[PDB]
Swiss-Prot record:
This is PI-actitoxin-Avd5a. Keywords: Disulfide bond, Protease inhibitor, Serine protease inhibitor. Exhibits strong inhibition toward Streptomyces griseus protease B (SGPB) (AC P00777). It comes from Anemonia sulcata (Mediterranean snakelocks sea anemone). GO terms for molecular function: serine-type endopeptidase inhibitor activity.
Amino acid sequence: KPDAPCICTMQYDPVCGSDGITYGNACMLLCASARSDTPIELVHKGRC
């Protein structure tokens, strides 16, 4: 998928994605998978 702005909401839902990074939200993630370094992969909807 293309780059998706990480401004979905402010529902601070820090989801841990395969990489060891707690993304403020699955969308913030979209920012990660869009301009992070590697295609992370959610694993736990929290602080790991």
